[PDB]
Amino acid sequence: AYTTFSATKNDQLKEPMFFGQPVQVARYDQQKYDIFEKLIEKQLSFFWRPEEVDVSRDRIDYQALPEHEKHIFISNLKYQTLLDSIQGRSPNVALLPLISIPELETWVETWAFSETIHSRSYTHIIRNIVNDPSVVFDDIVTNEQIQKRAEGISSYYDELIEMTSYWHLLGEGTHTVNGKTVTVSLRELKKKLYLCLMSVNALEAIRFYVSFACSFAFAERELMEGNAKIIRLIARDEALHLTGTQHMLNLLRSGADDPEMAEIAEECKQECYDLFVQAAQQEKDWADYLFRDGSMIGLNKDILCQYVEYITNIRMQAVGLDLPFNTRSNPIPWINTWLV
Amino acid sequence: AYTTFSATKNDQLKEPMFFGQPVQVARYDQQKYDIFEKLIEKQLSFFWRPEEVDVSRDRIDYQALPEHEKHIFISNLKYQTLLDSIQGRSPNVALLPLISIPELETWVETWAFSETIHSRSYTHIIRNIVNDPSVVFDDIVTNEQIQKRAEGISSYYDELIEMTSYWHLLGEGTHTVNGKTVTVSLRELKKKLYLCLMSVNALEAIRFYVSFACSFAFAERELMEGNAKIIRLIARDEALHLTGTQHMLNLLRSGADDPEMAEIAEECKQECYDLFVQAAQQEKDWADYLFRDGSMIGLNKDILCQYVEYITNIRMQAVGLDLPFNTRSNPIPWINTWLV
Ligand SMILES: [Hg+2]
Numbered sequence: 001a002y003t004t005f006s007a008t009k010n011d012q013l014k015e016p017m018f019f020g021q022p023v024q025v026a027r028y029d030q031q032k033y034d035i036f037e038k039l040i041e042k043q044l045s046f047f048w049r050p051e052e053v054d055v056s057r058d059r060i061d062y063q064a065l066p067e068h069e070k071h072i073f074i075s076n077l078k079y080q081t082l083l084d085s086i087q088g089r090s091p092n093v094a095l096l097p098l099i100s101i102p103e104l105e106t107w108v109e110t111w112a113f114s115e116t117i118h119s120r121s122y123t124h125i126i127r128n129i130v131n132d133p134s135v136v137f138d139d140i141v142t143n144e145q146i147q148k149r150a151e152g153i154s155s156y157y158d159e160l161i162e163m164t165s166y167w168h169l170l171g172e173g174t175h176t177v178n179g180k181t182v183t184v185s186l187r188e189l190k191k192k193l194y195l196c197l198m199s200v201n202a203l204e205a206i207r208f209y210v211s212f213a214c215s216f217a218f219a220e221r222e223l224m225e226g227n228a229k230i231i232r233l234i235a236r237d238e239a240l241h242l243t244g245t246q247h248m249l250n251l252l253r254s255g256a257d258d259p260e261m262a263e264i265a266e267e268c269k270q271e272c273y274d275l276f277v278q279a280a281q282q283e284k285d286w287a288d289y290l291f292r293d294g295s296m297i298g299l300n301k302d303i304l305c306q307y308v309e310y311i312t313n314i315r316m317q318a319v320g321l322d323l324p325f326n327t328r329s330n331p332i333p334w335i336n337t338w339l340v
Numbered sequence: 341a342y343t344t345f346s347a348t349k350n351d352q353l354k355e356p357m358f359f360g361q362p363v364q365v366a367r368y369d370q371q372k373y374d375i376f377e378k379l380i381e382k383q384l385s386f387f388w389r390p391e392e393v394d395v396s397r398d399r400i401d402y403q404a405l406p407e408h409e410k411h412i413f414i415s416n417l418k419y420q421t422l423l424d425s426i427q428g429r430s431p432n433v434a435l436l437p438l439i440s441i442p443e444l445e446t447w448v449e450t451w452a453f454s455e456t457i458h459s460r461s462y463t464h465i466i467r468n469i470v471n472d473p474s475v476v477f478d479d480i481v482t483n484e485q486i487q488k489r490a491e492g493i494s495s496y497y498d499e500l501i502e503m504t505s506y507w508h509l510l511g512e513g514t515h516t517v518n519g520k521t522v523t524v525s526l527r528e529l530k531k532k533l534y535l536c537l538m539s540v541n542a543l544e545a546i547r548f549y550v551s552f553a554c555s556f557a558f559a560e561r562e563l564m565e566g567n568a569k570i571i572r573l574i575a576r577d578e579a580l581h582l583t584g585t586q587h588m589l590n591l592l593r594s595g596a597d598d599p600e601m602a603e604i605a606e607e608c609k610q611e612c613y614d615l616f617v618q619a620a621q622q623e624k625d626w627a628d629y630l631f632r633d634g635s636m637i638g639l640n641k642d643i644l645c646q647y648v649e650y651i652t653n654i655r656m657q658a659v660g661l662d663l664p665f666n667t668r669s670n671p672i673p674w675i676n677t678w679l680v
Pocket residue numbers: 094095157196197200
């Protein structure tokens with residue numbers, strides 16, 4: 001099953017990305033896929049520290065905000081904090097026991113690490129603008145609506161982690177565990193990982209980009225500029241994370257890695273279409289809560305719905321799926337000045 | 341029973357470090373133990389990249405070394421590579437599914453990330469001094485002499501990972517798995533974690549510190565100066581990682597955190613004492629492979645075995661175990677010019 005140092009001298013250049021022999025020597029002189037090496041380098045160039053960004057004027061700007069847009073700001077912030085809390089721990093708990101090449105193993109640990117920095121920046125902002133952080137942080141867990149647009153994220157990772165432990169302990173086969181039949185199939189585990197990856201792709205490429213647009217609406221009005229400095233940095237890292245899953249998924253589709261992953265990508269092309277349409281509709285539903293006690297001059301549900309469509313079509317194309325929505329030009333081209 | 345976002349609103353200030361509820365919100369505004377937040381902050385400010393230390397002249401110096409001394413240099417480096425290959429991945433795969441407080445969860449991910457940068461620095465050194473890297477890297481896996489501890493270190497981690505998968509899947513009790521009986525006990529899992537934590541403490545506290553003495557003896561002779569600049573920054577990092585395991589162990593045995601961990605630490609006293617003398621012995625034995633073809637100026641088998649004894653006594657002292665070796669002063673004071 002899993003070992004932290006596998007004892008077989010193997011050619012790490014001939015392993016698949018996932019499900020081969022566990023990585024044991026971590027070397028960076030040679031890589032099967034150099035894009036993961038490029039990404040580690042680029043991410044390390046971008047090392048930034050949240051504490052050094054001045055957000056003192058955002059306490060005054062936030063204070064001056066009307067209650068309805070104070071509600072938009074904080075609800076957006078609470079969802080960003082939910083997503084990076086899961087992205088901090090989950091690439092490491094779910095993907096890291098299944099990797100077989102070194103450059104992907106380290107990219108995954110570098111990717112989960114930059115998410116904990118994003119979590120730290122959210123503590124930095126909340127602690128400056130609000131007088132007791134705990135009403136924000138305890139509300140994340142319990143808000144029916146924040147969990148409602150998050151529906152499916154923790155489930156995908158949790159099902160993957162469970163299936164992986166059954167495969168590590170028991171191996172492929174049909175087994176009797178406490179008098180129940182349990183079938184472990186590597187093919188099924190492979191599509192569980194593939195759909196997990198496709199969901200991670202939706203999360204980083206769409207869900208964060210909708211939240212970024214809600215954030216920079218305020219900076220366009222010249223409000224909350226400290227928070228906009230941080231989100232600009234967060235966004236520059238999400239660019240890399242997104243590029244990462246786009247290539248993981250496209251090399252798996254190419255059939256140049258594990259040939260059975262090419263096969264799975266085709267067989268579930270419909271599930272991959274259906275999870276992006278689900279995630280698009282979830283981001284749209286949230287608008288009913290975001291503009292609940294009032295909308296904003298440049299930002300309302302029609303602008304949010306038109307941007308979700310816009311961004312979902314771009315992302316789906318980048319990974320070879322059919323576009324669900326009618327083509328449109330970018331409803332909010334001002335976000336270009338702020339981006340990634 | 342692992343989840344990447346538990347839905348229960350819980351006071352994570354009252355949670356135990358391990359085997360409580362999985363962390364769901366990542367917050368850094370309050371913490372149960374301030375030391376892990378302090379270790380994250382120090383580690384972030386220590387960030388360095390290997391690429392800007394030039395190891396160029398180290399090629400001439402290595403080529404000019406007497407054969408036996410280049411055997412010592414390279415065999416020491418090979419061991420440093422094995423131990424950080426294991427340490428990049430293993431905090432994350434073995435500890436992360438068991439943590440119940442956020443500041444410890446993000447210290448384990450920051451801890452593990454700084455190890456991969458150490459693995460990147462060993463590739464930077466080897467690439468430059470031994471223009472065919474695969475000779476060095478393929479020999480770490482198979483080398484008989486490096487191997488005995490490789491196996492011992494990975495064994496603690498692998499049995500904890502395995503017992504943890506059984507615990508999350510089946511929970512406690514007596515279960516049947518394909519005709520066999522399998523008994524899962526949280527008490528045993530707690531011992532397993534404790535012995536593993538004790539072994540990671542020996543690795544960073546003793547095993548790395550014996551290899552530092554071998555790297556700085558060359559720098560004392562003004563040879564391998566690029567390598568020396570890099571081990572200086574690695575060593576600075578290791579001091580923090582060692583502070584961490586010391587505090588987690590001392591808080592666990594005090595009974596301050598979980599009262600059952602205090603009991604387990606008491607029952608395990610003689611086998612923790614034995615794991616440490618075994619670590620020191622395996623370090624002492626490596627010296628006969630190292631002084632295979634002869635010895636060096638400033639370091640030899642006897643002075644080196646004295647240092648192992650000295651350093652083991654200090655580290656066992658700090659974690660409140662009885663000292664195994666007869667007390668002495670530091671055999672090689674010069675080393676303090678390079679350590680923190
Ligand atoms: Hg995933």
